[PDB]
Design a binder for this molecule. Structure first.
Ligand SMILES: O=C(O)C[C@H](NC(=O)[C@H](CC(=O)O)NC(=O)[C@H](CC(=O)O)NC(=O)CCCCCCCCCCCN(CC(=O)O)C(=O)CCC(=O)Nc1ncc(-c2ccc(C(=O)O)cc2)s1)C(=O)O
Ligand SMILES: O=C(O)C[C@H](NC(=O)[C@H](CC(=O)O)NC(=O)[C@H](CC(=O)O)NC(=O)CCCCCCCCCCCN(CC(=O)O)C(=O)CCC(=O)Nc1ncc(-c2ccc(C(=O)O)cc2)s1)C(=O)O
Ligand SMILES: [Cl-]
Length: 328
């Protein structure tokens, strides 16, 4: 079972209405109470706008949802409601519909974000420890609430580097955890997909998010973004195996009785495990410490039951400087 023993059965300990999102009935307000100002982004499921609430002059973001199964809308809404007030989780302010088309939309707080491609080039050692610790709070919180995010990546982490604010965004792929449930493996961005997804192992858990977090930590301390840069889902596993090793992959597959797609026979090759110190050079040495490497080593592991939980990662010595400052 899940390494996060205290969080494994939580949803079974709550009321059915907590997780039964098919049965959830949202309360929809009127999008006419918001004035759209500028488009921020677009993707396959939504587009997002900066807006002003006309009744109180607050700046907000409006995410207008593209047509999908009503079930996926109910899921994202119920998850955000269950996460109300959670540490470093993007705040849902409202759930509205357009007054003529009835198209649903979600209203969030606005973050004065710095795009990660710019930000990651200027971060200090302390800054990386701080932002990673603040992201871990959000993952410990949502996992404690029985929810896997399933799309952790830099674009989904809003960072105001002037006010030192961080929010985890885009809960549209998130899902409730239940032991032994088979999940859809078509989640996460390619570069952040855990090995479990790449080998079609459906009985995954919260530890998927901890792989994606480790990929982020590696890209920050080593200044190589994304860290594992596959050309497609097959090549993604090859890129992982060139670092973690092929013999180590086969031991993982054997433990969980995982069958490997035969196409991998043509492309995996044979690769020794690399030492993490091999990634250090003059441009990143100031961001790497023994504590960083020990933490990373305990995140980027094939075996999803051996990866640290979010709380165990927060307890790691790498974050001692941040804990000291937050209590001083
Ligand atoms: O379309 C067509 O015609 C077809 C065709 N298509 C294609 O070929 C392919 C696919 C194919 O092959 O088919 N497609 C593409 O190439 C598409 C093009 C498209 O189609 O549009 N590429 C994109 O769209 C990329 C769009 C990215 C945004 C562009 C940036 C401009 C806006 C400024 C943002 C500035 N920045 C940095 C950053 O954002 O980096 C900020 O931070 C501002 C502050 C901010 O945001 N603060 C926030 N606070 C809270 C937020 C929040 C809260 C919650 C949630 C949530 O919970 O969700 C979300 C957000 S946000 C074609 O295009 O011809
Ligand atoms: O030890 C023992 O002896 C007993 C023991 N119990 C207990 O101790 C306690 C006792 C107690 O506390 O009172 N009870 C429990 O713990 C029970 C469980 C149990 O008891 O069992 N807990 C619960 O109920 C809590 C359940 C929480 C669920 C949270 C919501 C999870 C939703 C996941 C969706 C995943 N997603 C979406 C995605 O991933 O995006 C997928 O896509 C999945 C793939 C998929 O959809 N696949 C299929 N779709 C349709 C199929 C199908 C449908 C119909 C038909 C047909 O019509 O023919 C045919 C096929 S197949 C025990 O556990 O044994
Ligand atoms: Cl966890």
């Amino acid at each position: 079972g899940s390494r996060a023993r205290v969080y494994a059965e939580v949803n079974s300990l709550r009321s059915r209405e907590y997780w039964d999102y098919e049965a959830h009935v949202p309360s929809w307000g009127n999008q006419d109470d918001y004035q759209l100002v500028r488009k921020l982004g677009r993707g396959k499921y939504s587009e997002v706008f900066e807006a002003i609430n006309i009744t109180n002059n607050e700046r907000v973001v409006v995410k207008i949802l593209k047509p999908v199964k009503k079930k996926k809308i109910k899921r994202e809404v119920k998850i955000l409601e269950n996460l109300r007030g959670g540490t470093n989780i993007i705040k849902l302010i409202d759930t509205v519909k357009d007054p003529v088309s009835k198209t649903p939309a979600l209203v969030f707080e606005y973050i004065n974000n710095t795009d990660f491609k710019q930000l990651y080039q200027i971060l200090t050692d302390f800054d990386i420890r701080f932002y990673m610790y603040e992201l871990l709070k959000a993952l410990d919180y949502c996992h404690s609430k029985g929810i896997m995010h399933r799309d952790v990546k830099p674009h989904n982490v809003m960072i105001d580097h002037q006010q030192k604010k961080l929010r985890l965004i885009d809960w549209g792929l998130a899902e409730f955890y239940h032991p032994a449930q088979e999940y859809n493996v078509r989640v996460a961005s390619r570069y952040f997909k855990g090995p479990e997804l790449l080998v079609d192992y459906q009985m995954y858990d919260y530890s998927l998010d901890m792989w994606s977090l480790g990929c982020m930590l590696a890209s920050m301390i080593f200044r190589r973004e994304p860290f594992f840069h596959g050309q497609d889902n097959y090549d993604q596993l090859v890129r992982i195996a060139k670092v973690l090793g092929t013999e180590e992959l086969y031991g993982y597959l054997k433990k969980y009785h995982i069958d490997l797609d035969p196409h991998f026979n043509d492309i995996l090759g044979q690769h020794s495990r690399k030492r993490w110190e091999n990634f250090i050079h003059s441009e990143n040495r100031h961001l790497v410490s023994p504590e960083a490497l020990d933490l990373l080593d305990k995140l980027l592991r094939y075996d999803h039951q051996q990866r640290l939980t979010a709380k165990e990662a927060m307890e790691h010595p790498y974050f001692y400087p941040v804990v000291k400052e937050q209590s001083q």
